[PDB]
Symmetry: T
Subunit: 137 residues, 12 copies
């Protein structure tokens, strides 16, 4: 199927003063998706409720999700539970290597329900997640 | 007093694809409340802030609350603290038996401040909570 | 610099039925700030996303922050991460002595990134935080 | 006919700090109406213009009105004139015995155009007004 | 000057079920004004505050006012006081002969500050008020 | 307590064409309040319903009120009744000496429930009311 | 009575690229109405629901209607039924001679309930409909 | 299941000047539904698009529908097609006996896809449709 | 010219529960358009008035239209008439073979004014319509 | 053609404290237009963008324009360029004799593209511009 | 009089990346005003129309204005003309020494109508303008 | 970097009646950008303030700008000053050869601060500006 949802959570709108901005990340993702024959829909919110609604829509549409949940990765049971309804693949992405950072960042509520997880590969992590989904149609 | 607040948290709007829908649950609750001589006000949100506001209103009105907080049961100190202001009974309800599921679901921030807790009895749990409140006027 | 942000999180709007109201707290802070030659901007929200936006603005303006995050003190990685972007001082304040209360309240995601922390001194804690910032220009 | 309008004027939203709240009053009225085979539509406003619009709608629908106009009972010719257009019964209700209070409260612009008046019987006054209308179909 | 304000108060929107409707009254006034070389601006509200704002605008513009205040004729000091600021003529109009009706309708807060008063001549009263203003330029 | 509410009713927005404007009056009040160690919150409306809501808020906050109700002084039972709920002092102020004017202005629905009344001292009346409240803490 | 409603349906906003524009048509109608001692209220919509609401208002006001329903002439039972409630005359107008065009345009749901019908006389058809209504008062 | 949707189309808001009003019809339906152990959700629109959305929601919820489509009964393929998605029963209702009226009213796009059809039994037709659905659970 | 409008009418938003969703259809169209050197603007509405406005815009821009009008294909003269203003090609598309279905679906108000018509080729019908327009520049 | 646009730019809303107000000017223009068999549409804005939009509409409608651009007369190339699209006459009007004032006011970006220019004849300048257009049909 | 308007034009919201921010400038001005016994109202816009409205309000209130018009200093006749209506002092301020910069910045439309002008003294220029107005009451 | 801003000023929305429309220009730019590996964000406004905000965003994002400012090219110091904050390249584009037209069009406030300028090459000028930026990364 063509459509892949890329959903970014809290503080990811701040990319590029936290070099690559979130707008630039959207552009990079869109270009790579077109190359792969996909259509990427990229969304970012600091609101858990908004993220939940986007995940609910992806469940109702049976669309795959690439999710970088920011701080809610480590803290939100609610976001996990929304993701548990997804029928298509869920790929967890983090820009930083969360396993090399504070202890609290080494625990994810999403990893057990995700198909797979990419961390520490920068923004290329998103592009690699897209290529997985393209080669897994 | 006639009025009981029934407040549902994250992902409870998704009932009936997660058979009984949330609209149907509202109908069942309303019917049982009328039978018991009560009026039930049933509300659902995926927003912690919205849930907090509803709990604040119930505190200011000295109205009892039946609360199924969804994932925030396990995670939100803020929701607990809002519930601590309530003067009337607080009944915690979960549809599933949270004690039979993942370890993280066996811990609730609400149970220590609730009057009581019903889990694992399905949607009938709400109806049983209503009957407690009716027989405790 | 003149401006200091005072940001209150969940349930702090309920001060004075939880004697001093939040409006009164704003007045007290404003008066003390004028005495110190500062301008205080006091804001309160029960919404994590709203708190994040206010912290983002303070980062972009290089303004100091006095933050009483309420229940999110103990639970929100996202709020921590927003505060990590601040270049000016961050002073954590709690009205109650959180170290004398439930175990879960003795852990803060903010303390490790804050300049300093004041707890248990009541509403005067805010005024003392302001005086620190004034004497540290 | 099934429908009865119950219209409350200024300060009646403050019931229960001025024990029974306005929400509770609505619940009590609704329950009694169902028992009587009626449907009660209960509305409250501190705005004369809003009350006038509700009375205008009841005139256009030929629906009966139970009206507790609050302070406007004693002061508003405009509200009287709107009520003069009603074709169905108008029942004036006051919770307090207005004849036992200040002199200005013993004069009503509505009493001369009302079918009848109940005062001093508490919130039961509304329920008794409903029973009149039910037995007068 | 060309412009005359015609301002109708409470219950005057109900003309023609209380034969001529308020829309028809506007049409009649507009036609007569054009014949007289004037421009009539006709407005109606059940809101005292709205009437006050229209009178305030006419004061700031030094425009004459034809005012049929409905029930507020007999009751509103506030409307009187707004009219006291007018520099151009104020003509009070009532469709019915208020002196032939209930005692309370025979007292007007506006008559002492009006240039003159027309009552009991029907809707033609407005047209006669316009002709006064035209012949008094 | 720091906060005092100053509430102006109908036509008081027109000050300074009815020299000192309402904006200027707000400035004068704010300055005097700061001198006295108070915070003044000054509001004006031509809407009775809006005034009622502001008085309701002051009742719920146990804050004192300085009220110049304009024409509603003489006419509104509803405004009186809202003021009767206040627990802190109510000071009635009029700029003009109402006892030297028309007979209808010599009767107030508010005076019997007010702590005290200042009339005829101009805009300084407000400043004197503030000084009373400051010396009565 | 002065008021006549002129109601245009789908595609009539496109006049003057489909020479005379709809704005110009409104102007022509208004001028002719003034000459005849009438007031014309001219409205156009591509929305059936909006047309229905305008017809409902004309029924409640007992005002005559000149209706050029565009394509809905041939297709809408709902519009017919709304027009059946009118007590004053209904004049059907079409700019083009619908009887000289496609077969489907030679059938109207409105003609059987209209007083009369004018087709093929251009925009003058509206002006002639107005003159009928003026001479039939 | 408890919930039944009752959907009324064009001109059904005009009931009771076209004796029983639409508000009264809602009341009658609600009462009968409660007696039968159901919950009725009654909606009316003159907009085809709005009716389509309500039918779409009933399809997604697998809820039964009682539909009186007004004039669109005879004309709308789109409404038919929306109803074809319903999995629960569809009961077509008309207040009037459409088979005794104009020829065009004797053809329905909905009858072939409806479970059954009630016509000519007045407003009781709705109540009888509800009783069918209750006895067919 | 680059731009082609693809306009879908009633019930086409329901694709993929009526496998391919409307979002997916948009993606497929966009990709094929880019391959052909075109830009496709894809819009869907259940509102006739909205469809009319989109067709009006395409007329004013002299842009070609691919139109799948859903049920309005068979019923709307208004939509036909809007399409008659188009100067660029109009291609009618239906996913299903309408000639193999109910008799009423074998009649189209659009076919006589369309350049051409594709039916029964699924969603590929849209892509084939795009390729026609690209090879006809 | 009947319609003439009269467009006023910055500071022209302030007429009558800068005797005749802008409202009065509108009235005078409307009356003169009716006498001449025209319809005048009079608009005023302090926003260049708003003026541009009004000129764009007049270009699309092939309607004549009487333009008093205020200060933008001397400064705005953008307004000139919008006026260059007009096909019907453009008449430039100024109330004051701009040639007798500061040097900067003696240069207009509009005069070279206008049909003609009237200055220094007061508000009658507009009426004379209207009479030109009427006699030039 | 207490009130002074401080109005900033285009690009002045960008202060502190173009050290002192606009928020900080507001704070500095407010503090200095309080010291001088004044109340400063500080506003900034990139919209000429918005600046014009603020100047219009200051004219109607007979309040003094400190104006740093940004680029419109050199270009806007409209802003000049609005300022010409002011009866109280107008003080022109620029942060930079405009006489040391490009030739076009050495010409101001405002200087000839201003009381006086301060340039090149930084943000202190505003504070010095305030002190002028305070010593000139 | 991928993103380039293309910003069009006054009257550029009117392209294609002033053959290629603004929508078509957007399409052409988008296609060329994709070919070059860029993402173009194309915006048009007749509002100087809106253009300023878009330039401010591009400054904060360190994104390059292709700017065709329309008439403001020749007149706006404010727009120049906003562009002076840009750190990435600024390319000035005009469709027409401004040096062959009126004298006032041969002067630009933007040229001295732009990297470079393209005029007179039609809409291809934008595409050539994009190719510069792509080859200058
Ligand atoms: O490295 C990442 O992508 C992160 O998701 C960014 C975060 N917030 O935006 C973190 O909280 C996190 O642990 C890692
Ligand atoms: O079983 C329940 O009712 C739950 O509250 C549902 C949840 N979210 O909606 C859970 O997160 C939960 O643990 C149990
Ligand atoms: O004592 C405080 O100031 C607290 O921040 C208040 C809280 N919510 O408003 C707490 O959750 C907390 O632990 C302490
Ligand atoms: O007793 C009552 O019900 C009253 O209507 C309440 C009032 N306001 O809410 C009064 O002003 C009144 O006289 C009595
Ligand atoms: O006769 C009139 O015109 C009146 O103003 C109508 C009223 N309300 O609309 C009255 O209250 C009145 O006394 C007379
Ligand atoms: O003198 C005053 O302050 C007054 O309150 C002003 C009024 N309206 O604004 C009056 O109606 C009044 O009697 C006195
Ligand atoms: O000729 C007319 O006036 C028409 O009503 C115009 C139409 N739409 O605007 C038609 O559909 C029609 O048949 C005739
Ligand atoms: O009799 C009915 O219920 C009808 O549905 C009412 C209609 N519109 O509201 C008709 O168009 C119809 O044929 C019958
Ligand atoms: O097959 C199609 O594409 C159709 O247009 C779909 C419809 N509604 O969405 C029909 O009403 C139709 O006849 C065919
Ligand atoms: O005299 C006029 O009509 C003017 O257009 C008024 C102005 N602004 O409203 C001027 O700027 C002008 O030069 C003349
Ligand atoms: O130096 C100043 O304060 C200026 O007003 C700032 C400007 N825009 O914000 C200029 O255009 C200017 O010439 C000087
Ligand atoms: O030729 C161009 O692109 C121009 O920028 C268009 C204009 N407005 O849209 C002009 O004012 C201009 O001089 C040239």
């Amino acid at each position: 199927e063509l459509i892949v949802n890329v959903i970014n959570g809290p503080n990811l709108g701040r990319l590029g003063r936290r070099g690559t901005t979130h707008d630039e990340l959207v552009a990079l993702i869109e270009r790579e998706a077109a190359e792969l024959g996909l259509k990427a829909v990229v969304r970012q919110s600091d609101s858990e409720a908004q993220l939940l609604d986007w995940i609910h829509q992806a469940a109702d549409a049976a669309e795959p999700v690439i999710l970088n949940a920011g701080g809610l990765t480590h803290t939100s049971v609610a976001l996990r539970d929304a993701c548990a309804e997804l029928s298509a693949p869920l790929i967890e992405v983090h820009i930083s290597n969360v396993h090399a950072r504070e202890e609290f960042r080494r625990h994810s509520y999403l990893s057990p329900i995700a198909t797979g997880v990419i961390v520490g590969l920068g923004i290329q992590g998103y592009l690699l997640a897209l290529r997985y989904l393209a080669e897994h149609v």
